[PDB]
Every structure is written in structure tokens, then in C-alpha cells.
């Protein structure tokens, strides 16, 4: 999972 897609 990518940190920049954590909502």
C-alpha cells in the first residue's frame, strides 16, 4: 500500500 493514498 502507498502512503500517498492514505485517506
Amino acid at each position, epitope marked *: *500500500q*502507498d*502512503g*500517498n493514498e*492514505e485517506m
Partner: antibody
Amino acid sequence: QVQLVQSGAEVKKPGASVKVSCKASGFNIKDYYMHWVRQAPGQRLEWMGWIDLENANTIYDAKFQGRVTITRDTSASTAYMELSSLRSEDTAVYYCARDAYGRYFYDVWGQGTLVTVSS
Amino acid sequence: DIVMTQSPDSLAVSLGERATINCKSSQSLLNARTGKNYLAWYQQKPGQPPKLLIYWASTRESGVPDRFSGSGSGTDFTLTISSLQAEDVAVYYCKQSYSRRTFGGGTKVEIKR
């Protein structure tokens, strides 16, 4: 007791394929991603890809795209990395490691699997 | 791909002294809506997988001694070992998890004598 146990060392000729296993125990793998990371002798860690352990969705690094396949067997609680068309440069220790949404860190690693590629 | 650069490549510190390891990313690792910098530090000894020390730039992992601390934001990060012990001789890696995954080159820490 969380642990990731990988299969044993491998020796392969150039052109061959290798499949390394990563047995997970002590947590619900469905909440996690399993990543594969390698390390050539004396070099830095290099990420290869990940698989979503629930739905088996994969993301590979472009450097291995077309040569690598990451799969997971839910009933065996195990993930696998298969690397094909092996060449000398693939000589490395291969690691599995878990991660998950909201973490973005590798808290648990397998012990490593040495793959030597040589004539 | 995000490029991670560590400095120095190797460090020699006397027992009880301070070790400082720098890590630079080619782009910001900060997610503005979570406030997190997705930077992590790992310690690796021979024959072993890396061990997580610090994640989210400054959050220490369970069981890691409090002499290890991380700081920085955006593109510049630092790992400080405040009083080096013999057990701390290892290679340290920074690693970004903002977009895919990239490790730095590693910094080898030795005891100066």
C-alpha cells in the same frame, strides 16, 4: 506468535526459474500485504513487488515486471515469489515482509532465502 | 521512482558517543491530509533480515531502545543514536513508503577505537 518462514536456499543455472515460499502464521493475513525485497551480496535492499493477501492483487517494480510472479495460497497461509529467466545478477537474499494499510512499515520479516545463480 | 540518498556511507563513533545518519528524498514524503512522513529506519546485521527501528519519520517501534530517535520532514530526515553501544554496530537503511518502496544505500556504523 507472528512469524514468516521462508523456504531454503536455492542454486539455479542461468535461464532457470526459482519459486520461494513465505509461510505466515500468528495473524490474519487477509488484513495484510506481503512484499518481496531482495539484497544482492554487499548491496542495498531492493523492493520487487507486493501482493494484497486478501484479493491477490499484485504490484511489481518495473525492474522485475515480466520476470516475477507473486501469488498467495489462503488455505496454506503462504505467499510465493517466482522469478524466471534467472541470470547471475539475480544472486541475492530474497526476503518477504508484511505491511498493511495505515502502517507503511515492515515490522516482520522472513529469515531470507539465498538464491545463487551460476553455471 | 523516489530516490533515497544517505550520508555518510560509514561512521566510526566511540562507545557512548553520538551517531547521526542523514537521509534525503528526491521528493516530499509528506501526505498533507494525514500529516505523516512515510520514512522509516531499519537496522541490519550480517545474516539477518533488517529490523524496524523508526517509522513515520519519528515514531519508535515497540521494543526499540529510546536512544534511537528520528527527526525531519519533507525531503530531509535524520536518525540519531544518542549513546552508541556495542550492540548498535550494524548497517542502517532509510526507506520511503510514500509511493512504492525505496531504500537508501545504507550507512555502516562501527566502534571507533
